[PDB]
Symmetry: C3
Subunit: 659 residues, 3 copies
């Protein structure tokens, strides 16, 4: 057992700044983790109780790999002029302030910020930022039964087999999408126990079957899976067909682990403390390591859980003795840059500019949760100065969502506010209609999609939280679809996809180097299958609008179930072709007449009329060009205006003739 080679090379020859400059920087964080892994190798029960034997190999994954190697950081580093191409690049995972390995820290806890800022405490406290980290006893949404089935009695409990609350420090997550756990040794829970209990050192440690997944447990029954299989012939139906991604019961999937084959061995320090953090109140590291291995002692000494005030604003915020106030830009946890060699090779003028080949973290073939920032970085919105806080309230990030009263589960409790909810409804400072007036105007007119939100087409749930690759069939715009894309640009095309395999991929399902495609303007885009026909169980708008056009969840008539991108493109063109044809005629007419007002004299009263008509026709052209949807924001009204405008041009042309 040892740390990753990358970590060991840095430990052997470190070039941090803590000792030389008195300022901590990337390499210092890599170095400081050595003692934690030494401790775990001697003290974790996998070794003390199970003799280092597991069903599946242990694969150590420390900061050396996560904070340096992920997102092809080493390839990015080589493509950069920084440090002569010999440097390191932390693409996805890193902290801005001290890690949980430094004691003492200056955290005072959110309740103390709340004494003076009760208003923000209240909104923050009813958000998933506040409860992403929770202890046993803090799950009223499952009546505090972490080991009983949540929904149907043949589906999974939140905790895996053999894992009981007394050896769990915390759960991570929510009913919203999924849960994970950390054991009392603060080791990421990538395993379960068969034929025994971790608590007693009995049975066997088995890789995988460690991650509770709401959609698989609740929505994705074998019956639903058979329905998908009619359309997608290789969709897995039985548990065994979920393979390495699955496990022993539906709802508990293998994550950072392949069922019975391999499992990551990872401290919270290496990864999870970047985005689902906690802080302890210990005065020094001796106190910390003494408690390490007892959940109750660690819980009692926990001064901050989850994404609290001070995770965003800094320890002690602006207070005297604190570490200095920050205003988060969200990129610690919501950015997730991933360098793509394929995007780099699109243009020779990219030489020395590898930032132009950044994409987003992908979980196998889907863009990963927490990648909204790397998505928005290649949008017109980001170019125009817009950031997360432009649109989002940074405190009330969950909104007034509630549980599902029609769900009859063995443990599920629908009455616990947002904790019971399958959805998110973040509080917004800006709606699309605030900035896009012409689009709002046309889309407000009574028509096919006028009831739907702008976000319903423009912000599909493309993102994978669970890395449930066994159900990722991305050309069918499903089925591992749990977070919302922040791309906005919709591409209208019969074939071009948003998501593409890397050129290193040797099998269409191996998931190698997937990335977002870039359009002609160098921007990310949403293809029409995602925009119109995606299948998801995370999207409240979709569920309130008859499942949109998904062959799996649509309640529309079968001819409006969109089964491939070309079909969707055909529907779009049914509206766009007639709009563009009339649009062109009108503009052709407007020039036909403007120019021909030099080659003819008219009775002043006819001249007035011709001017008047083409001026009104020009108003319609401008509105439609500015709208830019070519009828997709409202065919009926767009056609009404274009019909009028061609009448104007014909009336004017009739007049010009009589001369």
């Amino acid at each position: 057992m040892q740390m990753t080679k990358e970590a060991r090379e840095i430990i052997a020859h470190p070039k941090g700044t803590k000792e030389s400059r008195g300022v901590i920087s990337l390499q210092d964080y890599i170095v400081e983790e050595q003692a934690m892994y030494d401790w775990l190798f001697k003290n974790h029960p996998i070794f003390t109780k199970y003799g280092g034997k597991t069903v599946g190999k242990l694969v150590v994954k420390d900061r050396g790999e996560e904070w340096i190697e992920e997102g092809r950081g080493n390839d990015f580093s080589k493509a950069s002029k920084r440090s002569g191409g010999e440097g390191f690049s932390s693409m996805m995972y890193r902290v801005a302030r001290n890690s949980t390995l430094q004691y003492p820290n200056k955290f005072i806890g959110p309740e103390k910020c709340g004494e003076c800022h009760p208003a923000q405490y209240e909104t923050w406290s009813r958000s998933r930022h506040a409860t992403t980290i929770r202890f046993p006893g803090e799950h009223p949404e499952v009546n505090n039964k972490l080991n009983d089935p949540v929904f149907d009695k043949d589906t999974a409990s939140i905790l895996p087999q053999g894992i009981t609350p007394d050896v769990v420090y915390c759960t991570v997550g929510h009913i919203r999408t999924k849960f994970g756990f950390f054991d009392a040794w603060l080791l990421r829970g990538t395993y379960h126990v068969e034929g025994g209990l971790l608590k007693n050192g009995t049975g066997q440690i088995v890789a995988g079957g460690n991650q509770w997944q709401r959609t698989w447990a609740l929505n994705l029954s074998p019956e639903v899976a058979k329905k998908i299989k009619k359309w997608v012939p290789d969709f897995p139906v039985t548990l065994e067909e979920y393979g390495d991604n699955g496990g022993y019961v539906r709802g508990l999937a293998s994550y950072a682990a392949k069922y019975k084959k391999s499992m990551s061995f990872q401290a919270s320090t290496s990864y999870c403390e970047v985005c689902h953090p906690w802080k302890f109140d210990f005065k020094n590291e001796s106190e910390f390591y003494a408690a390490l291995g007892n959940a109750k002692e660690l819980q009692k000494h926990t001064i901050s859980k989850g994404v609290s005030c001070e995770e965003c604003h800094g320890a002690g915020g602006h207070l005297e003795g604190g570490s200095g106030l920050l205003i988060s830009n969200c990129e610690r946890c919501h950015q997730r840059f991933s360098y793509s060699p394929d995007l780099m090779r699109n243009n020779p003028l990219n030489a020395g500019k590898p930032d132009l080949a950044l994409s987003s973290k992908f979980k196998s073939m889907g863009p990963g949760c927490g990648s909204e920032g790397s998505q928005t970085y290649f949008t017109a919105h980001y170019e125009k100065g817009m950031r997360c806080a432009t649109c989002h309230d940074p405190h009330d990030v969950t909104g007034n969502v509630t549980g599902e009263k029609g769900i009859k589960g063995v443990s599920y409790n629908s009455e616990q506010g947002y904790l019971s909810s399958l959805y998110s409804k973040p509080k917004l400072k800006k709606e699309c209609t605030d900035c896009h007036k012409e689009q709002a105007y046309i889309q407000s007119k009574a028509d096919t999609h006028s009831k739907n939100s702008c976000a319903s087409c423009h912000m599909p749930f493309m993102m994978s939280c669970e890395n449930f690759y066994a159900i990722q069939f991305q050309d069918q715009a499903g089925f591992d679809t749990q977070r919302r894309a922040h791309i906005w640009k919709i591409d209208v095309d019969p074939a071009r996809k948003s998501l593409v395999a890397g050129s290193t991929s040797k099998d269409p399902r191996d998931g190698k180097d997937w990335h977002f495609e870039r359009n002609e303007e160098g921007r990310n885009f949403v293809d029409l299958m995602w925009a119109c026909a995606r299948t998801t169980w995370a999207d409240k708008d979709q569920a309130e609008a008859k499942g949109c056009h998904s062959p799996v969840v649509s309640e529309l008539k079968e001819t409006l179930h969109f089964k491939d991108q070309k079909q969707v493109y055909n529907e779009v063109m049914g509206w766009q072709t007639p709009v563009k044809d009339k649009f062109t005629q009108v503009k052709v007419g407007i020039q036909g007449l403007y120019s021909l007002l030099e080659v003819k004299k008219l009775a002043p009263s006819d001249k007035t009329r011709v001017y008047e008509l083409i001026e009104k026709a020009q108003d319609t052209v401008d509105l439609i060009e500015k709208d830019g949807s070519w009828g997709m924001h409202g065919f009926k009204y767009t056609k009404q205006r274009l019909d009028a405008a061609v009448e104007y041009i014909n009336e004017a042309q009739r007049i010009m003739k009589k001369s």
Copy 2:
């Protein structure tokens, strides 16, 4: 004599973070005040020279009550899941950085920021932020006569009877609204001395008669009071009629005190250092306590006065050795939340969300000064991400206001720029017209209110700075009206009021738990009485527009003096009803015609014409809908466009008729 019970409990069982974490938090600030109060109980003249005897009882009011109990902080705390409902909530009064009890501090003074930032120093220095704290010798606007009448010889001086400059550390405030003072022991001036001078230990300490009020001393003469009384029969005229709120001479009211009945005993450290601060340059606390009681010594060692650069930006700003730069969001001094159990009770959807039952500090029955933030918090503006500095320049907060040459006073001096002025004109980055273009366009059409500013209707002076409850008659939108409401939304209703009494109120004027009402969108709103017919002497726009529709100050004909809200509402309906009616006709016509074009056959040029007409009508409807005032921004223009649009629709119907 002792500190409040709330402070003593926290001192007895403190749960701050200074010792356990090395970070100062709320409870540490409560604890640190113990020494100051012990000192005051032994060393203040009230005790050393007057035997602790005062006319009216002494009421200690330290941070334990001000920073913990105010705004029903304890009820908010019990309504919250935070700390199992057993925590504390500082609703209004707290600091962000060290208080004036820490020595040494890192303040260098605004003149030092000004060495490198001369431009911002200049604009800041000509603002009331810069001069809210002043020493004797810094009042040219009264020819430095703090003890002679400011205006008429029968009205008040700035300092009350028995209080002389040499025992005053500072004055607080301006001619703008009011003044207060702090004695050389840094105790808040809630008293005067009858038959003697404080400096000689003679006479008697008497509660109240301590706050100079411009509006009472200048504008609210017995003559004006009598005029008001014809409308409002209970309105006080004689000095005796102002009761506990008054005192011994028109212009000096009792504030944080009741004349001869009670007076707050309060160090500057408990309350005033939050919003009207100063900082001293002492190396340690021994030096500070040694200077205490000596105005000249304290003044000499004052390194920052009032809302200086570093009060906003932190002590030493971004400089090496400083405390770290801050950009103020203004909530230290301009927010003032107050929790309203009635707003919780009346909306059951707010259960477990005490933040949605937040209101503003009320001074009796009017929202307090410095509550703009708690007001804006419940507006569309704040919801769209707008904050104070969206609209406001943070430095030039007073603007180019001047005195009134027409005022002849015993001491008043009109030539001192903003210091002489009765008004405020903060420099703005954004005007209403920058974001509300349709409203601006219609409003620019010459009519009844074309010379009104947008803020004249939308931002009435509803706020009470002085807590002059004796003249607060909120249903008549007067008469203690010194600061500008930041609410904007105008409600259109015959009876519904912006301001209402709490359910604890047992008498229409007892002033218990008054608060803002919330509309169907969960927002604050301005009722039509405030928007149209309010009475104030702090609103220059109103003074320059014939006093608007106030029965008391309107110069308009008597038929345009609005005596109550139903009368205003009926005037509004007279404009909105015709507009709304015609708007509805035009909108139905447009849609009806569009629908009929889908089936009824017309010659090409008729179809052309019908389309053309309904598109023109649609332009008009879109404009008027987007404006959303239904004629209140420009009645004749609005109805004219709609009358023209009605003509377009009728011609279009004429064409449809021919076919049949």
Copy 3:
């Protein structure tokens, strides 16, 4: 040799705050410099090897003069109530954080910020902020030949006579405009050496001939000069006619010096560290003074060069052990206020308000480079809350600019991206057309200037980077024109000038107290000569649009070469006068028809028609009024459109006739 009197006075009676308060402030910076000047008076080669003898007088200029006296700080101070009118005002030059005289510092260098922020590193690293300070060996754009001619073999090399790379700490600047150098003793390069080499202490120190200038070396050949001479009689053609401003070869001018007459003696600490900084990693001031005089040692210990992350964001940024995160408002280096007594005197409503009499730094008769801030301060834009970061990306400040392949040069290499480029194209978040919609609409119509940017008219290159006063003829809008004015408001007048001499000026070219004029709204403005007819070689838009109307560089026909402002004004009237005529005609008509409508009875159909026509004409009027250019944004569309509105009025009249 000694420090300036202003410095010595402060040193004698210091009222800083470091000792009393523990906080560094302005006067502390002045005092701290004393050791450096003592050291230079004893150790610089000028004294140790040349015996204090120079061709031209040594003029010491320290922080005492730069940070205190510049911009008429003492007059501003006296005009202010601050400190009784007896204090100091640092108008242009000061730092926010420790100077380069304090050791150790907390800088970790931009490559360490880049480890975690690879994206911002990439865009920042290809900007002139990043390379404004460079060491010998880092000039691929002249093939690293600092002593060979850049362009033609009879024009200048970057380094002057007798100055070799081995005794130069760094160069300042780029091909873009100009270069400068610092010797190994960190003295500002205001001299060269005739008859020997500085490294051997041979030859004589000669004042001036020290600043390499791109425009003089490349563009302003004797032929071009002759051409300008035909329009401007006094224009210098021969090297000798450039006088004190010139030197011994075309391309190397005298700056902070007069050729063979005077040269400033200035440490980097007094001035250049404000805006073109660097930082050393020295652990104390002893290590620093020990390396002084050795270019290689200093270079080896340089941890930050130029305007790096930490110069804007503070040393160590937000990192633990750092000095605390900043977000720069750019005023350290781009503001440059200069108090103008003339502006104060010429408006007695500004009495007691010297801030309102602030102008910008002028380099002789042109506004200085890095005065964008003091310029925008008196604009509508600043008043509305706009700041540098409203329009600009703060990282990607240079943009995708490239060299010129057509240039023949002895050393010039045109293939090093932005390093080879003569232009700047800063990345913007907002374009003029984002906020100014009506102007954008009119300007989009195919017409005379429709291909041109808004910035082309509104932001001419008025600013002097080089103080090349020998070619400054401002009434002719030329010819020392290297940076872009940030004023936007164009004044339309036959004679009023943006740039005027101070009342202390005696000769029209003595360059005394020049300043911007203020218009009737208290704002800076651009006169029509600058807007339309200016001569520059720094403006890419101008170069891509036939040199605009410069008599010197225009490729237009000769009737479109504008020689004076009166001629420009007249061309503007050619357009605005017909537009305002028709405009007024329409307003009169609308008002007339409207007044008649209440006393006139019309058939329902006739009335419909008159309202409608009036209403169309009103829309046109509103658009033209909103545009506010009266044809300057597109004469053809504007005039055509007003003509039609006249027709609407005329048709309305024909219907009103039936009364």
